[PDB]
Symmetry: C3
Subunit: 148 residues, 3 copies
Amino acid sequence: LLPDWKIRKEILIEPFSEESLQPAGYDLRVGREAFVKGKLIDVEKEGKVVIPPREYALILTLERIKLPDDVMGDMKIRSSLAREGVIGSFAWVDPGWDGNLTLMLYNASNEPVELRYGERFVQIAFIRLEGPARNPYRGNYQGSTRLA
Amino acid sequence: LLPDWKIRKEILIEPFSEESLQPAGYDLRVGREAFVKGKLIDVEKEGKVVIPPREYALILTLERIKLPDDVMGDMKIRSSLAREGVIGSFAWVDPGWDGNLTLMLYNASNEPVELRYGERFVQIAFIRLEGPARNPYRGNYQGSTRLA
Amino acid sequence: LLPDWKIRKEILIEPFSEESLQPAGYDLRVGREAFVKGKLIDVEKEGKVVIPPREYALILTLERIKLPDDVMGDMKIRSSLAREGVIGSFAWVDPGWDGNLTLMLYNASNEPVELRYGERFVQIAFIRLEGPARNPYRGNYQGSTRLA
Ligand SMILES: O=c1ccn([C@H]2C[C@H](O)[C@@H](COP(=O)(O)O)O2)c(=O)[nH]1
Ligand SMILES: O=c1ccn([C@H]2C[C@H](O)[C@@H](COP(=O)(O)O)O2)c(=O)[nH]1
Ligand SMILES: O=c1ccn([C@H]2C[C@H](O)[C@@H](COP(=O)(O)O)O2)c(=O)[nH]1
């Protein structure tokens, strides 16, 4: 697992925010795109993304994450959102990945959960593989937008 | 964390599917058993398992996973399902585990989520322990069926 | 990742329960505080905490977890709860953390999920950082109570 000072040197995080740097992870921020109730949302334009109660939202990360072939992305919801009743349905960030992440966030609470554009909401930890993956990732690769 | 080429040599995955092999994990597939709305389902016979909207399903993995005493199973939903609004409630795969996994998948969306028999739905990563666990797992062990 | 025998020597777990020790993790137990339906609950006094169907609860862990600057806390719901339809919305346990954890647990089932005071419900795994985090955690730090 990469500590904070090693995250700067191993993972390409654009744009990078020093405040998003955690002791052993990086706080991914809300990007320009979102998907709530079957509608695409321009979080960059609208400025926010509101996850209605008991609804899930596909949120595009502001950061474009590029993982080396020997690093795995382990994402967890920011504790703030968890304490708000928000559940994150995160998959692995395969070694070699490159592009903005489409993160599923479910508002299990009865109050709407508002997420400002560029606000930190998911801390991604980076676990180093024992060796570079024989076959780096090649699926939703190079995604710069919300991918379904 | 075991890369793809090391997963072949350290973890017993039966049946094994080369397509389920990920850069740093293995895509567990839907097995023969499932549990939705208080009913047992024969996904092998019925061929599919449908998680109704806002309902959770206990799904038996097609693969029988046997973990060495120094490897921990880290499971995450397949991004495809996450983008569908499906949330996985996965526990740790203790070092030493052996048997098919009962995976809780919650359909947080408003559309039914269909999972074919043998379809990949959960990628399990394998983290190597600093040393073999003093007491390997002995609880729902050797489970070859859905375990409640 | 710390095996069971290394968890005793690296992580400060108070109070510690040998039964909560897993092959590669520790089963965190339900503490004295809980938060369900906008109300604070005295699980120590009341003895239990009931997560109503389709509701989430903020549960304070009985154990006060103190992580070294080079260890990350990876929490997952206990398989028992997962098989019950309970989903855990857990964030990272930053290296250096010290204090009781506020764990979000969502009852996705249609039956109430009862959690006795001191009952194990979340197994926390400990991943060692490649090096001590440059900036250990300093946010909801030293939390001995439910923190929102
Ligand atoms: O919530 C997620 C999780 C992963 N990814 C990215 C990183 C991965 O390379 C890929 C998902 O494939 P898996 O690693 O989950 O198999 O897409 C996302 O965009 N959103
Ligand atoms: O979603 C899961 C997670 C784990 N297991 C298996 C592997 C573990 O050995 C055991 C669960 O015990 P814990 O590791 O969660 O404590 O059952 C499952 O069947 N389904
Ligand atoms: O579910 C959780 C997860 C984490 N923490 C603690 C440990 C962390 O130090 C901090 C949350 O900050 P992050 O690590 O999630 O960024 O609070 C909790 O109390 N509950």
